[PDB]
Design an enzyme around this catalytic site. Sequence first.
Site, mmCIF file in Angstrom:
data_model
loop_
_atom_site.group_PDB
_atom_site.id
_atom_site.type_symbol
_atom_site.label_atom_id
_atom_site.label_comp_id
_atom_site.label_asym_id
_atom_site.label_seq_id
_atom_site.Cartn_x
_atom_site.Cartn_y
_atom_site.Cartn_z
ATOM 1 N N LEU A 1 50.295 81.636 69.082
ATOM 2 C CA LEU A 1 50.857 82.515 68.062
ATOM 3 C C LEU A 1 51.403 81.836 66.808
ATOM 4 O O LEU A 1 51.982 82.491 65.934
ATOM 5 C CB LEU A 1 51.945 83.390 68.693
ATOM 6 C CG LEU A 1 51.503 84.134 69.955
ATOM 7 C CD1 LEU A 1 52.680 84.932 70.518
ATOM 8 C CD2 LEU A 1 50.319 85.047 69.635
ATOM 9 N N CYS A 2 51.189 80.533 66.705
ATOM 10 C CA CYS A 2 51.665 79.743 65.574
ATOM 11 C C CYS A 2 50.929 80.057 64.269
ATOM 12 O O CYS A 2 49.709 80.232 64.259
ATOM 13 C CB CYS A 2 51.525 78.257 65.912
ATOM 14 S SG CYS A 2 52.127 77.117 64.658
ATOM 15 N N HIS A 3 51.676 80.122 63.169
ATOM 16 C CA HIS A 3 51.098 80.414 61.854
ATOM 17 C C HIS A 3 50.437 79.182 61.235
ATOM 18 O O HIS A 3 51.034 78.108 61.181
ATOM 19 C CB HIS A 3 52.177 80.912 60.875
ATOM 20 C CG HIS A 3 52.872 82.168 61.305
ATOM 21 N ND1 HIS A 3 53.829 82.189 62.294
ATOM 22 C CD2 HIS A 3 52.749 83.445 60.872
ATOM 23 C CE1 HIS A 3 54.270 83.427 62.454
ATOM 24 N NE2 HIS A 3 53.628 84.207 61.603
ATOM 25 N N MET B 1 57.461 73.862 65.377
ATOM 26 C CA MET B 1 56.359 73.570 66.287
ATOM 27 C C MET B 1 55.579 72.334 65.878
ATOM 28 O O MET B 1 55.139 71.570 66.732
ATOM 29 C CB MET B 1 55.411 74.767 66.410
ATOM 30 C CG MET B 1 56.006 75.954 67.141
ATOM 31 S SD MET B 1 57.031 75.470 68.566
ATOM 32 C CE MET B 1 55.889 74.546 69.572
ATOM 33 N N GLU B 2 55.402 72.132 64.576
ATOM 34 C CA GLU B 2 54.685 70.961 64.100
ATOM 35 C C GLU B 2 55.437 69.678 64.446
ATOM 36 O O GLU B 2 54.825 68.693 64.831
ATOM 37 C CB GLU B 2 54.465 71.034 62.585
ATOM 38 C CG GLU B 2 53.297 71.916 62.153
ATOM 39 C CD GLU B 2 53.620 73.395 62.175
ATOM 40 O OE1 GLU B 2 54.774 73.765 62.465
ATOM 41 O OE2 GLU B 2 52.713 74.203 61.890
ATOM 42 N N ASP C 1 49.087 57.504 77.688
ATOM 43 C CA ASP C 1 47.671 57.199 77.867
ATOM 44 C C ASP C 1 47.377 55.709 77.873
ATOM 45 O O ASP C 1 46.586 55.224 78.677
ATOM 46 C CB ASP C 1 46.826 57.852 76.767
ATOM 47 C CG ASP C 1 45.355 57.465 76.862
ATOM 48 O OD1 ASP C 1 44.756 57.694 77.931
ATOM 49 O OD2 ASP C 1 44.800 56.929 75.876
#
Lengths: 146, 146, 146, 146, 146, 146
Positions: free
Chosen positions: C64-66, C102-103, C117
Amino acid sequence: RPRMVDVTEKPETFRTATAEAFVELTEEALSALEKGGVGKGDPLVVAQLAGILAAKKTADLIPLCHPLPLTGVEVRVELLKAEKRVRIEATVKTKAETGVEMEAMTACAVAALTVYDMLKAASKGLVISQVRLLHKAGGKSGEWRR
Amino acid sequence: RPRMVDVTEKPETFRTATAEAFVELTEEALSALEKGGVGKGDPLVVAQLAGILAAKKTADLIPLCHPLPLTGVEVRVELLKAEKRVRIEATVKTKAETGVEMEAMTACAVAALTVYDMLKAASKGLVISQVRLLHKAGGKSGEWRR
Amino acid sequence: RPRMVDVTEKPETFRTATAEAFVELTEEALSALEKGGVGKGDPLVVAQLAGILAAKKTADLIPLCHPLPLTGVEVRVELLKAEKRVRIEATVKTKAETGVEMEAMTACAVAALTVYDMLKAASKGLVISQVRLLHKAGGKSGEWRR
Amino acid sequence: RPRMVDVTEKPETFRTATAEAFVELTEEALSALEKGGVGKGDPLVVAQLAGILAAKKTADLIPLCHPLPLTGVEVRVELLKAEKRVRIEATVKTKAETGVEMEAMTACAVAALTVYDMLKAASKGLVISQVRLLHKAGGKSGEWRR
Amino acid sequence: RPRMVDVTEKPETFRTATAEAFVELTEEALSALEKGGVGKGDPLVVAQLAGILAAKKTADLIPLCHPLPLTGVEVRVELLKAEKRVRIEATVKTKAETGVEMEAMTACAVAALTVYDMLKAASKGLVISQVRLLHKAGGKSGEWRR
Amino acid sequence: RPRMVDVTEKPETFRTATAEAFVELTEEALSALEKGGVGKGDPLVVAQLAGILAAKKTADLIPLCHPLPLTGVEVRVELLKAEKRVRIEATVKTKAETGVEMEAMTACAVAALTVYDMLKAASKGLVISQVRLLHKAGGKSGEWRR
């Protein structure tokens, strides 16, 4: 809950799938296609390539779809003047534990969306109709035909 | 030759677009949807999210489409039992120099493809029909309605 | 149902967000990092770039992120020997109708995953801990601080 | 350490960039291009579209590149028979706080790579030469010309 | 220098990996989750799908990660009320020359980030904790357990 | 019409490809590289990673390219001071029915574009020259050498 079905134990076999889609044209849209477009490029040519690209992007678009290396992709986008229709057909192939029905279906859907994109300037009401599977082989269910 | 039409000089205005798509169900597919699926998750739920994701991926799928930051995406995937049909509707919004018809259309197309993906196990013949634009606002042509 | 909240009417303002993440190291992993890795490259260097790339890919990963054009991304991945910890911090900026929390969070998460990793060969049990927001500005709620 | 330079405070202005690339052809490759390819499609047509698509994917390929909404993309891929050369030119436009030199350069590079992809069957030694910027406008440095 | 370790000579064997992540909830966030969210959709449902999608996108996010076709992906996102915690678990499978630890770890990380995305409106301070590997099989090192 | 050549019937064999690219430097650019860059990070380091990432993204950029799981990717970006040149070399490996020439070529091209991106601030006229294949093995045509 949703899940990418486990098919790790299944063997790697040859799979194939063929689907088609149609774009119904208005006279304005048909006239445009018979001339190469409306100042933007040939819709049929651009759409055909969009379909091939879309086939490869299928697993990224369909949530539970299995990522697979494709060994073949054929897409055809032809104008059917008398029927005032654009017919898209796509056949995808691979060697995997799951089928490529989604890849064939998605290739046709995106090619159709591309035809719409380049003709919507003259006709925003154009409809994409009948995205459907025509054939598939491989898998336990075996050969399937519409 | 194909080209992403130059709209740099055009002003940044509010755009909106609404489209819909339908998946025609067989009795086998309907029965499956009324129970939550066939061992893979709820098709309607997964498809609804696939539509939102697809709207954001539109410019990557449609060759000449303008990349735009979306400010709103609404997708609905509902079962119409009596009609034995799944109806998908999507409305996209933004502030740009071009419309979001492709984003709305693509959202519906991919949601429909996802419904197909999760019901094809029981019915490979399911058809995606009538992906079409219902409305759009913004732009010189102004408001458009089907 | 899920939806990408409509923020079309909201004004385009300056937003900023800062987050951090930590990777707890075993003695084996620390020894490896103090030498440049274990035959694969410098984990801290590769992770730092993965974070920047991840910030740009955020809208593609979070449903749902813009989608937003980023105007700034800073990521730091440093070794804290005494604490046997790798600290990742990321600050993202933009001018939009929604925030970039969010970014920043995603940049830290992916950088941490990259550190893992490249050190998992020597220590598969390494843990990524405390991915959290530290600050953000812009929006109605205004400035926020942990 | 690497970083996506902060340009949040800078104003949103009109930017443009033009680049070019060349593919040097052997007689075998030229003969193939004058016929439409070697059983795979027209290299010039497919390459032209790959360039447009590549311009939009630039920020995903170049680590520190700023993600920007493009407002215009033009790509031309033409055969220069006498020179036994394929010339690719691309012009990209937008309104942002940073330039689109990378978008123009990447469009030319990928179009060239596509020409190579479809002619390498007959000539694996084909060389991509001179990917370079020809012009750009916008920014503090202002207009630039080669 | 960094490099994608060469494993071309290694045989194609069955690999599996399981990881988990946790989101620590405040009372405000818990209350929100027990009602289906805060005007945006069910965080647990959206996050679960984001995890599956993320598993498939792993090689694109982790620089030196080997691209692999996944044969299975299971993700679970459940609310642990008493513990005021959201627990995410993910198991990925495939047949390859390298493991899928990164795919399992990334699936959990992105699902956690999605839970955060949909609850940050009420609690920006929510923390993602303990993204860690629980198990893995396949490879020379063989079975591993936390 | 364009098509992704069908190679489903062909056997899965070991393939390898090596390519190179060059960036010609001005004195201003060379001076910048001998110091670590011009306020943005080390161009050689960032470019090397961009090349590895690009190799994995090849099928998404080249329209008719076959999607393949890569088993090895090596990229080197070194400064040749006396020659005032940056030399990029990339070797890609896999087991498939088609070659990885495009993956090697694309890795070099994008690494070169990244070197340009981080030095264009001081020299917008820098040229990317000679992206070319050096070697490849596997396939019916067998071993090839420049």
